[PDB]
Design a protein around this ligand. Structure first.
Ligand SMILES: [Mg+2]
Ligand SMILES: [Mg+2]
Ligand SMILES: [Mg+2]
Ligand SMILES: [Mg+2]
Ligand SMILES: [Mg+2]
Ligand SMILES: [Mg+2]
Ligand SMILES: [Mg+2]
Ligand SMILES: [Mg+2]
Ligand SMILES: [Mg+2]
Ligand SMILES: [Mg+2]
Ligand SMILES: [Mg+2]
Ligand SMILES: [Mg+2]
Ligand SMILES: [Mg+2]
Ligand SMILES: [Mg+2]
Ligand SMILES: [Mg+2]
Ligand SMILES: [Mg+2]
Ligand SMILES: [Mg+2]
Ligand SMILES: [Mg+2]
Ligand SMILES: [Mg+2]
Ligand SMILES: [Mg+2]
Ligand SMILES: [Mg+2]
Ligand SMILES: [Mg+2]
Ligand SMILES: [Mg+2]
Ligand SMILES: [Mg+2]
Ligand SMILES: [Mg+2]
Ligand SMILES: [Mg+2]
Ligand SMILES: [Mg+2]
Ligand SMILES: [Mg+2]
Ligand SMILES: [Mg+2]
Ligand SMILES: [Mg+2]
Ligand SMILES: [Mg+2]
Ligand SMILES: [Mg+2]
Ligand SMILES: [Mg+2]
Ligand SMILES: [Mg+2]
Ligand SMILES: [Zn+2]
Lengths: 59, 306, 148, 152, 108
RNA sequence: ACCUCGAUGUUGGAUCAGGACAUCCCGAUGGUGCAGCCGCUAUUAAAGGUUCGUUUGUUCAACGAUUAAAGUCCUACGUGAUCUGAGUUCAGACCGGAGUAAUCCAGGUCGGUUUCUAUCUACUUUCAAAUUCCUCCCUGUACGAAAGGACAAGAGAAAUAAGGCCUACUUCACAAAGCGCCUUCCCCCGUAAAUGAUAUCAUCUCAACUUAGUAUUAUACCCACACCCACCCAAGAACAGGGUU
RNA sequence: UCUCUUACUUUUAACCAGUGAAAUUGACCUGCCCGUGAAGAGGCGGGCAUAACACAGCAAGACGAGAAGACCCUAUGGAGCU
RNA sequence: ACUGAACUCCUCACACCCAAUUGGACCAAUCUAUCACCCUAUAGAAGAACUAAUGUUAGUAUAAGUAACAUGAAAACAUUCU
RNA sequence: GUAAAUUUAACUGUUAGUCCAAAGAGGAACAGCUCUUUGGACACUAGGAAAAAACCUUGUAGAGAGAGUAAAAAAUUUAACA
RNA sequence: GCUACCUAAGAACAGCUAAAAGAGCACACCCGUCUAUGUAGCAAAAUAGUGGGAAGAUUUAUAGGUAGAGGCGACAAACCUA
């Protein structure tokens, strides 16, 4: 019975009746570790440079 | 409490033949009304694409016959007669499983007095006699035909491989010897009432019998399919298909015929009619008998090797 | 065993303690024997302590029949129609006095399993909990994943 | 498996079955009406048809004479078969040995049938009559038939 | 093989009181149009069949009385007659058996 | 000597086999004292298969003829309410030996009753996606010094297994069968290689990554809610099912 | 006999009617896998499974039924024989 | 930090959780003496208490409506037939 | 610090024991093996270690819809080279 | 009154080959080799088939005799009322 009261969907699509039934979305437990490209360059400028590299290096 | 009843229970001595005659005439008129599918309002006819599948048909198993090839080899063939085959209903791609479209096709005509009332209403709306069997064919959307169209044997052409599904001959409750080919036990060397028994059924450690164990039981009355049967000949006058080898089930049984799904014959329908065979717009009637190019025709020069 | 016996909830008869307390015991009827070794405790109870009991509580009517019996008895009748019969057969006077005082102390309600030894008629003062208590509202009452 | 297997196993063997059917057929020829268990009556009806055909084959036919001599065990019904029964069905081709179901045998509750040669100076059996043409449904169908005839 | 345990009355009631073991109700039963004695469809009425059988037995007894002994089987047709009922012109060569009765109003 | 002596029946064999891989064959790789054909050894792989006989009760063993091979093991040394009873091991008897004798021998031999009507659990078509050998060509080529002698690709023939069928043949005969005929479709992973850092070379990568590399997001079956006395049936123990225009 | 089994008949069988036993039975609302445990679990632990209820089969388990093991040992228990 | 016993505390009460064995307080039925007189008391006594002995007898189940067991055919019930 | 001990009188029952820690002996520095000694537990309650005799926590009896606790949950991941 | 042996007085043994016969084939009759069924069975030892004998050391009816520390035994520890 508890599993009959459970509804799973693999994507963003949800049926309209269930959506009209929805209340009080729960918050996500994990924190989405925020990959490099979405970092609001102000934050990059805030973060310090830990080491000065040699000028004669190729990487 | 309402007693049961049949169609001719309260009918009179004079009214019984009248009812039979009238119902048979209405049946024949309905059957003849569908003779020209291309003039009523045909659904659009699409060209054949590589990854496309067309409809099959329902046939009747007539019997088996010998046949000989130009090299002198003998093959036994089975005759499948198309009695009254029509497309009954068509479901859209998304209305069944979203995987493939479906076409329902009906078999030989039966009596209207011994069918379910819902089935009777369905066939009344369709405007056709009731069919003994209905089989569903998975098709691509470009092969759909209008419901009520007739299907003819020339839908299949010689030099083609088909699949034949039917209910095999039922042998009732059979012992393990006949059912599973089990060897029995010796006949005279001392055995005590143990000549056809299955013997052991499991081991002692397991303490039970596995689900897949072979034991005596009802045998034979199940649907089975024969794959890759080559058609050798089409008789257009009587709508007969000559299919290589044997076909499951008894004679006078209804079989489901459709193109073989074996990988060796995936796209061989470039030369097969692809809404269906339509004998109205052909503008040239087919011969009474279409043969395969390797078949010794009945009128032959009595082939001599060289 | 509780599963093999009836049950009830804790209750009063007519809201006894709300206004005035009233004695729920109505009558005590005693069957005691003139002769007979089993009615000796009852005999001396009637001799000494029945008069003082009647004077102590005058809301109870006490009858003493004094008939030949093998088993002397006391029948307690309560304002709610309940009837209870007890045997005072071969009991001491102190035993009988304790019995009659206990009978006067109890109410007529059945002595069965009591089921949650408290009876409040107003269990909630700040409002009973429902799944929307302790739940904040949204602007325009918009449920999750809405548009307008 | 008994696919397409006529001739039920009746007695203690094929000869016993043949002799039981022969006794039933002799009784039928003698009495013109015989009651017996249903399946035996079915087999004996199948046999009585061909007995009447052999009788119609002619008195002087040697093969018919031998067949009658075997199948009639009283030797005084063979003249009956050849001069009463066969000449009774000269016009008709195969329509005799009317067979009906009678309620049940009392002791063992067996399914019971009655079988009679037509003609049969015996009193008639309570045959099941069809519904009269004056009933409401039959009158409606008759009106439909008349309307169809007029529309033709 | 012996039962390891006694079967309980609950199990026995479930086995022997389920619908497969119960008697089915039959709807083949209607009134006989003649004699109104509750026949069954597809089966002859017991009352009418008994009447016919009694008349046939009387006729056969008369046949045996007239025939003499065994092995007779006359080579002519037969006709049953009743009180009065002079023989008809078509039944000349037929054997005549007239026992004594008023012809029943079902045998014509 | 821990359960069982108010009974847990034993060796071999028959029948049916479930499972492990520590693989006998079929698949894929590394090394080789691997030129080729045969081999040896190691990694991975348990879907499939793993013969018939003479002697002996044999499991083993020897031998004969084959095969791609004739695997090891567990399953109450699987399985006697399915079977057998040839040994073992009761009562009869003989021989060799022991004993005064009765009697005895982890000596041999002739003979010697195998019960059970199934209450419970379990189970009784999982509807399907086969494997192997051989022949021909390649080729008498790759390879040697000679004998010898391959792969891969292709074509064709079978055998077995599974599933059906009766037109021939055969047992038979309004049927059922085999000795007859018809059909049978995807991989699997261990390594072999690009670019490239940690460690500006190089490095197949429990580095990020690119290939051989994934058959599957498989397709075939089957999927009609209530005419039903009764009759027939290629349907069937009963029930159910198909037909009755 | 077997490779290698098949067909039919009778009995049996299954259904209908009549009559009507016996062994057996602690109670049972009586599942599978792994583990545990008087050391081989339907009933215990962890999982999995799971509307109810007849009929026909089968014999893997219920250390299945029957016979207070006959084999072995013990008893200051017997008896036959020398 | 929390959970977690029949350990300990808390309100009230306390003789009220070991086999064999041993000590003790009561006690059902019955009969007898004397009471009592809708079923009791004080004493004396004894064939004095049964969820178990493959216990004895009787009843009734389970297996089970199961295994099993019957009557050659037609008819006029004279008779005839296989 | 504690409250038991000896003697006298009258008797039964127990005298076919297991595992754990420790010192040993035999065996294989095998055994859920056999034999001694010291102690514990079990053959009595409850909680824990998965179910669990013998390991750990815990004991003296009742009711409570109060409380504090006891024992009580396993952590580990690894080879370049001048 | 079964059975072992005996006593008295009886009975039976077709047909064929007859070598002459405790000879051969073979009925009745006596027995019980092997197989299958049965195993609470028809039966507390049977049925079907197949077998050994069947003019003799044969089979068999009747009455009588020998009895348990015994009888009887062409010794199987056989039989002496399952
Ligand atoms: Mg065989
Ligand atoms: Mg046997
Ligand atoms: Mg047999
Ligand atoms: Mg020990
Ligand atoms: Mg034992
Ligand atoms: Mg036991
Ligand atoms: Mg491996
Ligand atoms: Mg074994
Ligand atoms: Mg077994
Ligand atoms: Mg022998
Ligand atoms: Mg057996
Ligand atoms: Mg069970
Ligand atoms: Mg060469
Ligand atoms: Mg060269
Ligand atoms: Mg019955
Ligand atoms: Mg286990
Ligand atoms: Mg069953
Ligand atoms: Mg059990
Ligand atoms: Mg047992
Ligand atoms: Mg014993
Ligand atoms: Mg002793
Ligand atoms: Mg707590
Ligand atoms: Mg006594
Ligand atoms: Mg007593
Ligand atoms: Mg009792
Ligand atoms: Mg008892
Ligand atoms: Mg049963
Ligand atoms: Mg039976
Ligand atoms: Mg020990
Ligand atoms: Mg305490
Ligand atoms: Mg002689
Ligand atoms: Mg002789
Ligand atoms: Mg001797
Ligand atoms: Mg001896
Ligand atoms: Zn009537």
């Amino acid at each position: 019975t508890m599993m009959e009261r459970l509804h799973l969907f693999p994507d963003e699509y949800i049926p309209e009746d269930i959506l009209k039934n929805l209340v009080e979305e729960l918050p996500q437990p994990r924190k989405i570790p925020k990959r490099l490209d979405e970092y609001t360059q102000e934050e990059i400028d805030a973060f310090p440079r830990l080491w000065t590299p040699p000028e004669d290096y190729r990487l | 409490g309402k007693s049961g009843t049949w169609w001719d229970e309260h009918l009179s001595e004079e009214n019984v033949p009248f009812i039979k005659q009238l119902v048979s005439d209405e049946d024949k008129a309905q059957l003849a009304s569908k003779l020209c599918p291309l003039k009523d309002e045909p659904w659009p006819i699409h060209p054949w694409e590589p990854g496309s599948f067309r409809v099959g048909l329902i046939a009747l198993k007539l019997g088996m016959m010998p046949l000989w090839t130009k090299d002198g080899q003998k093959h036994v063939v089975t005759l499948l007669q198309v009695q009254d085959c029509h497309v009954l209903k068509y479901t859209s791609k998304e209305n069944c499983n979203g995987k493939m479209a479906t076409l329902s096709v009906g078999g030989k005509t039966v009596s209207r007095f011994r069918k379910a009332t819902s089935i009777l209403e369905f066939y009344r709306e369709l405007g056709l006699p009731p069919k003994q069997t209905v089989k569903i064919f998975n098709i691509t959307d470009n092969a759909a035909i209008k419901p009520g169209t007739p299907l003819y044997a020339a839908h299949f052409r010689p030099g083609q491989y088909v699949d034949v599904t039917a209910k095999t001959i039922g042998k009732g409750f059979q012992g393990v010897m006949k059912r599973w080919g089990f060897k029995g036990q010796p006949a005279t060397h001392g055995q005590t009432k143990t000549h056809r028994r299955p013997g052991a059924v499991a081991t002692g450690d397991i303490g039970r019998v596995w689900p897949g164990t072979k034991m005596p039981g009802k045998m034979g009355n199940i649907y089975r399919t024969e794959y890759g049967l080559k058609v050798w000949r089409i008789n257009t006058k009587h709508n007969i298909i000559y299919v290589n080898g044997s076909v499951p089930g008894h004679k006078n049984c209804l079989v489901k015929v459709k193109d073989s799904k074996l990988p060796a014959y995936k796209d061989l329908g470039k030369n097969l009619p692809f809404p269906t065979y339509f004998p109205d717009g052909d503008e040239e009637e087919l011969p009474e008998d279409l043969y395969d190019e390797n078949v010794c025709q009945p009128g032959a020069p009595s082939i001599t090797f060289a | 065993t509780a599963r093999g016996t009836p049950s009830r909830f804790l209750a009063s008869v007519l809201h006894n303690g709300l206004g005035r307390y009233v004695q729920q015991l109505q009558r005590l009827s005693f069957s005691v024997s003139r002769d007979g070794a089993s009615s000796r405790g009852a005999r001396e109870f009637v001799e000494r302590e029945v008069i003082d009991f009647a004077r102590r509580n005058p809301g109870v009517v006490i009858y003493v029949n004094s008939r030949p019996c093998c088993v002397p008895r006391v029948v307690a009748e309560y304002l709610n129609g309940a009837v209870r019969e007890e045997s005072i057969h071969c009991k001491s006077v102190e035993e009988i006095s304790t019995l009659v005082q206990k009978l006067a102390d109890q109410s007529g309600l059945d002595v069965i399993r009591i089921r949650k030894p408290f009876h409040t008629d107003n269990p909630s003062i700040q409002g009973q909990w429902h799944p929307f208590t302790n739940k904040p509202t949204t602007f325009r009452g918009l449920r999750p994943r809405e548009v307008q | 498996i008994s696919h397409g297997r006529v001739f039920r196993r009746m007695g203690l063997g094929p000869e016993s079955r043949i002799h039981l059917l022969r006794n039933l057929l002799t009784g039928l020829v003698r009495h013109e009406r015989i009651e017996a268990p249903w399946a035996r009556v079915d087999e004996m009806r199948g046999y009585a048809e061909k007995l009447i055909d052999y009788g119609k084959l002619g008195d002087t036919n040697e093969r018919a004479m031998r067949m009658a001599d075997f199948w009639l065990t009283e030797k005084d019904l063979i003249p009956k078969l050849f001069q009463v029964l066969a000449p009774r069905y000269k016009d008709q081709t195969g329509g005799y040995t009317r067979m009906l179901q009678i309620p049940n045998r009392s002791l063992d509750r067996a399914k019971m049938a009655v079988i009679e040669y037509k003609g049969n100076c015996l009193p008639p059996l309570p045959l099941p009559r069809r519904d009269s043409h004056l009933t409401l449904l039959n009158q409606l169908l008759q009106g439909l038939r008349q309307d169809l005839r007029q529309s033709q | 093989a012996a039962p390891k345990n006694r079967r309980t009355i609950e199990v026995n009631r479930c086995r022997r009181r389920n619908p497969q073991k119960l008697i089915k109700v039959k709807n083949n039963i209607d009134v006989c149009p003649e004699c109104g004695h509750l026949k069954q469809k597809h089966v002859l009425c017991a009352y009418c069949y008994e009447k016919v059988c009694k008349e046939t037995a009387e006729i056969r007894r008369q046949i045996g009385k007239q025939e003499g002994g065994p092995f007779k089987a006359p080579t002519i047709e037969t006709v049953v007659l009743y009180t009065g009922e002079t023989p008809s012109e078509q039944d000349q060569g037929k054997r005549i058996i007239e026992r004594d009765r008023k012809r029943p109003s079902w045998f014509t």
